[PDB]
Every structure is written in structure tokens, then in C-alpha cells.
Paper text:
Ribonucleotides in DNA cause several types of genome instability and can be removed by ribonucleotide excision repair (RER) that is finalized by DNA ligase 1 (LIG1). In addition to RER, LIG1 plays a crucial role in Okazaki fragment maturation during DNA replication and completes DNA repair pathways. To maintain the integrity of double-helix structure during DNA replication and repair at the final step, LIG1 ensures high fidelity during a three-step ligation reaction: the formation of DNA ligase–adenylate intermediate (LIG–AMP) in step 1, subsequent transfer of an AMP moiety to the 5′-PO4 end of the nick (DNA–AMP) in step 2, and finally, a phosphodiester bond formation coupled to AMP release in step 3 (35). LIG1 attempts to ligate the RER intermediate following RNase H2-mediated cleavage and fails on the RNA–DNA junctions resulting in the formation of abortive ligation products with a 5′-adenylated-ribonucleotide, 5′-AMP-RNA.
We solved the structures of LIG1WT and LIG1EE/AA in complex with DNA/RNA junction harboring a 5′-ribonucleotide at the nick. We captured LIG1WT and LIG1EE/AA structures at step 1 of ligation reaction when an AMP moiety is covalently bound to the active site residue K568 of the ligase. The overlay of LIG1/5′-rG:C structures with previously reported LIG1 structures in complex with nick DNA containing canonical, mismatch, and ribonucleotide at the 3′-end demonstrated the significant conformational changes in the AdD and OBD domains in the presence of a ribonucleotide at the 5′-end of nick DNA. The AdD undergoes a drastic conformational change, during which the active site residue R738 moves ∼18 to 20 Å to form a salt bridge with 5′-PO4 at the nick. Furthermore, we observed that the formation of salt bridge by R589 and K744 kept 5′-PO4 away from the 3′-OH end of the nick for proper catalysis. Our structures demonstrated that 5′-PO4 anchored by LIG1 active site residues R738, K744, and R589 led to a conformational change downstream of the nick DNA, which resulted in the narrowing down of the minor groove and widening of the major groove. This reduced interactions of DNA with the OBD and AdD of LIG1. However, LIG1/5′-rG:C structures of the present study showed that the 3′- and 5′-ends of the nick were stabilized by pi–pi interaction between +1G nucleotide (3′-dG and 5′-rG) and salt bridges at 5′-PO4 with R738 and K744 residues. Furthermore, we observed that F635 and F872 moved further away from both ends of the nick. In addition to LIG1/5′-RNA–DNA structures showing that ligase stays adenylated at the step 1 of the ligation reaction, our in vitro ligation assays demonstrated a diminished nick sealing of 5′-ribonucleotide by LIG1 during ligation when we observed relatively efficient end joining in the presence of canonical nicks.
Author numbering: 262 to 388, 395 to 748, 755 to 900
The structure:
Amino acid sequence: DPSGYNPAKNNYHPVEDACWKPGQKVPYLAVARTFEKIEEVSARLRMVETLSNLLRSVVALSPPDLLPVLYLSLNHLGPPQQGLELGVGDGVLLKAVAQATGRQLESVRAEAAEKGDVGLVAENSRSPPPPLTASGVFSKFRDIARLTGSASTAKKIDIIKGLFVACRHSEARFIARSLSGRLRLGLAEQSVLAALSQAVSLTPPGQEFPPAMVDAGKGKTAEARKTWLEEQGMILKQTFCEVPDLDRIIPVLLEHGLERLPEHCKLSPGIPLKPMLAHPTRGISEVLKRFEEAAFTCEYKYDGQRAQIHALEGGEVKIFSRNQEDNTGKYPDIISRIPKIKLPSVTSFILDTEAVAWDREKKQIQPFQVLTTRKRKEVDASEIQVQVCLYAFDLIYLNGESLVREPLSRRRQLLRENFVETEGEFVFATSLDTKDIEQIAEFLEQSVKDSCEGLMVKTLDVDATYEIAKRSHNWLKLKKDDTLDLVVIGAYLGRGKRAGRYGGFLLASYDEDSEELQAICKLGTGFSDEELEEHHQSLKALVLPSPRPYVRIDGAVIPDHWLDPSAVWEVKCADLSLSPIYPAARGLVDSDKGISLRFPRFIRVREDKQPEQATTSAQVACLYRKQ
DNA sequence: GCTGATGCGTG
DNA sequence: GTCCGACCACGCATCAGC
Ligand SMILES: *P(=O)(O)OC[C@H]1O[C@@H](n2cnc3c(N)ncnc32)[C@H](O)[C@@H]1O
């Protein structure tokens, strides 16, 4: 009976405590019940142990189902480079829920909005189908993803409808949450990998049934078992960091075990790697304190796309994003300039660059906003209007050899010798090797004058290995980063923990000339759970049927609930930006723009102030001009 | 072909 | 103070209904 499956129990037996038989398909109810127990407890150690217990049972009884269970737990359809997209959100899902239940769409939409979760609407509104299996549900997910073109939505909903029909207990709750993209399991790539290494360590794969070894850490002490499990997890995470492909890792892991996995999987071009990231710093003094005496280089903080350029032995080139998505079609201009950025001796590499929009007429750098207007579909180079300049700063791979273990001085050296620069097309990142504080400060202000967001600071020899998929403390960011009183003119219904309350708010400034409230930004950060739920009734009493005549929101998202302009909030923001969406001070700085708040954050309520005493739109334009 | 609703990516 | 999972804003992209 899969409805009683308790993978959170102590002394879990991968065979006797499982809700299915050997050689039999893993039921999806076992996965859903694993999701329930993971969410009921808060200790992330117990959430990993509960997921491992399911994986141990999968490994022991139904090994071919390990890959679908992992992807279902990660809410992914496959390898990130494959580019498989469901094309399903809340809109298609509620249409399927209303169609399966025979209810109207607005009644289902009203319920989904009030309860805040679409999975609760599908579960409660339940409307003889065989029991769902893990690989069966996963195959239906990939089937929904393959449907494209005209009249594909109805075909997607039909697959979803048949799923909701076969759903029992909490299966519909987690299928709807997964299809909406918000599974909210509490575990992701780090925790799912942790549970997998624990599973194959406790219940080794490749055994004859019945498995003679079910708890390999039985006689170990608590510390010894913890130490042995921590190092086994480091083997899997180190191998997966270099080969982030579950389609490749899992088959070899099941056949040769975890300890022999590094001998079969090696870093090579063609498989995208999660790039190295940096930690923010609050100033140059913190940089030198954290770096102690380690020599560092100062690099420009570029405002573009992190592009991983893979050149395969033979001549094939692929461009990958930071999220391991293939962008080779988005950049045909970069593909055509590959032969003129390297020496003839270069036959294979993995480049770590920054794709920055380039004004070829002015020989200047354009902001990231101009880069986002680039077509992302299959473009041809002749129609590219926003050219890009490549800014390389690291070399992961060169001519069959990996350089992740070499220091940055060795990697930067091999990058400057084997690659040739072309102005406005491919150049090395503007760097400066120095220890003088005054020289770093001038380099930083220079960086801003060249339309960059600051400085990247990286160690050169001490702790200077390329750390894949890691936000390192050996890379530091020297970035450039106002209090305003805005009127709450609308509310947005919340999800997740804010399901039954408000999750966002539409703020507005006061325009003195037209005597109108102009929307300026959206706000949902800076709130404690207490001051949100304890004050949600105060804003709920301000709900208006229709917006006031003096409220102007223009192209901003229409709020779910219009609120009577009466609440004035003190809001802090990193900086101000020109927005083609918000109408606040539209014609006071630019002719057809307006000013919004970048990363706003709630501070306090200003009950002493009234909407007409809020920060004026002229005051907003003055703050932007002072930037 | 147009429009509005809808989905997706990444810094 | 560090790690981790979840979220997002604004751009392009996709599609239902006409
Ligand atoms: P900011 O907090 O906006 O983050 C900047 C991101 O861009 C990457 N990046 C820009 N420029 C470089 C260089 N020269 N070297 C390495 N990384 C760079 C950062 O890693 C951040 O992801």
C-alpha cells in the first residue's frame, strides 16, 4: 500500500519497508509520499535522509527508475543543454483543472488565487485508471514538452487531464506544482546529489536480489558514519561538477559504483559547466583583509552575459550559458569569429568570457538592456543589430588538457599566449595587477567611466584554482552599490508561504503637476512574516472595486486588488533606473521613459504621512540626476 | 496579421 | 558568516481566437 509509505522512519529497510516489489515499476505515490515527509520536517539533514531512503529502495528493487525519480525530484525534464521546455504555467494548468472537474475557469482561478496553490485546487477537486508510475509520469512530462505549434495547448491539457484522473491521495498536488514550475520541495541539485551518494553508499548498486548489503554503515559510530558519508558525497559532487549530466553519470554509477565513477567521467568540451562565481565585498579594505597577502588581479566587472565557449576537437563550437543552456544559435556572429581569436596550434578549448553589447560605430560598450533585445531564436548573422564584443578572462580547457587545477596565473598566461585580440570583437578583460590601495580605487572609478559595474578581484596563485559551480571567496566583487516614501496603490496575491495573503504591492509616487499617483515599482521584500500577516487585514480593508481616477499605472502589471491610496511606506532601493513600463516622472528626465526603483525593500510604515505628502515625482527625477 | 494572454531565461 | 533553495524583472517567444 503506497499510501502508507514512510521513508522518514528510522531503521528504514530498502526492501521490506518499500511499497513495491523487486523488478516492478516505482509508483508515483511513493515519490509523492516522499515529498510529503520531506516537507513535514524542517531539518535539512532529515530531508536528505528521507530522500536517500527512497533512492535506496529504487536502487535495490527498480534500478531503471532511478533517473526518472531524480529528475522528478529536481523538477527537470532532462539535461539542461537539451533545452526541453514544458510550455506549461498556471494558465494551462488551471484550464486542465477546470476541464477535468467540469468547473468554470474563473471559479478555478478564484480558488487557485485564494488558496495560493494550484496543486491544492487539483487535489481537493478530484474527478478505473491504473496506478501512476514514476517513469510513466516523467514520460508524460516530456510528452507535454514535445508538443509545440498551433493547437498544442489542447494536446498538452489532454495529457495533463489524464494524469489528474489517475491521481490518488497527494499525487495531483505535486504533479500540478511540478507542471507550474514551483515544486517547492526544499531540496535541489545540492541536496538531491547528497541523498544519491548516501543511497549508493548505504545500499550499494549492482547486487543480486535479495541485496545482501542494505546498510553498509551499520557498525560505524555516529562520527565515523558521518565522516564516511561526507567524503562519499564529495566524490559524487566533484565528478558531477565536471560532468553535469545525469544521463551520463547515473548509468556508470550504477555499473561500477561511486568510487570508480571518477575513472569513467572526465571533463571535456561539449558538456556545459556551471561557471565560477564571486562573493560581494563592501570595499577594498575587506578585499585585502580576506586576501591577506595573496597576490590578486583587478578585472573589469562587465555587464553582459556569462558565455562559456566550447571548441570541440574537430571544429565544432558551442556556446553555453551560466545555467548550462545552449546559446549557440543565439550567437552566430561569435561562431564566425572563432577562427580569428585563436592561434593555429589551438585545437580545443573551453573559454570563460563575458558577452557585452558593442556599439561598433562609437567603439563603445552598451548596457545590458541593449543586449537583452538580441533575438534568442535561431538568428542569422546578417540580421544581428546588437553586435557583441567578447571579454575573455579564464581558460578551463586547452588542447586536450584541463586547467581547473592550475592557478589563475597559469590559466591567464595560457589565455594570453594562445588567443589573439581583435578590438570590438574579442579582447582580454581589462586587468590590473597591483597592491596599492590608491591604484585599485582609481581602477574602480575608471571601470565605471568605461560603462562597467565595478571590479572583479581574483587571486593569482594562492587558492587560485578554477572552482566549477561554486561561489568562491577567492573571487570578489567591488560593485558600485535611496530612501523614498511611496503610496501603496495596489496589492498582488501571494504564493508559497504568502498563499492566503498578499505577496506583492504596487507602489507609487506623487506627481505635483497633475496631482496624480504614478506607479514607480513593485514591492515584496523587506517584510517579516509577522508584520505581513498581522497587517494584511489593514490593507485588505482598503480594497477598491475600481482604481481611483488620479492613479496612473500605465504598462505596469494591473494589481489583483486595487487599494485605496492611504498607506505611505518608507522604501529603500539600491539605485534608480529608467523604465519603459512605469509612468513615474515619465517626461522629467527622458522623453518617453519614466523612473523605477531597482531592488526596492520595505523599511517602515509612515502613518504620519498622507498620499499627497509622499515623495514627489520631481524629487524622484532629482535623485536619478544625482546618480 | 493582430492582439492579448501566456511561457521562458538569467543577471 | 556560510550554504542553499526559491524568487524575480524585463526582455523575447509562443499561441488562442478572431
Ligand atoms: P554583479 O554583481 O552584477 O555580477 C557580475 C557578474 O558577471 C560576472 N563577471 C563579469 N565580469 C567578469 C570578469 N571579468 N571575470 C569574471 N566574472 C565576471 C561575475 O562573475 C558575476 O556573475
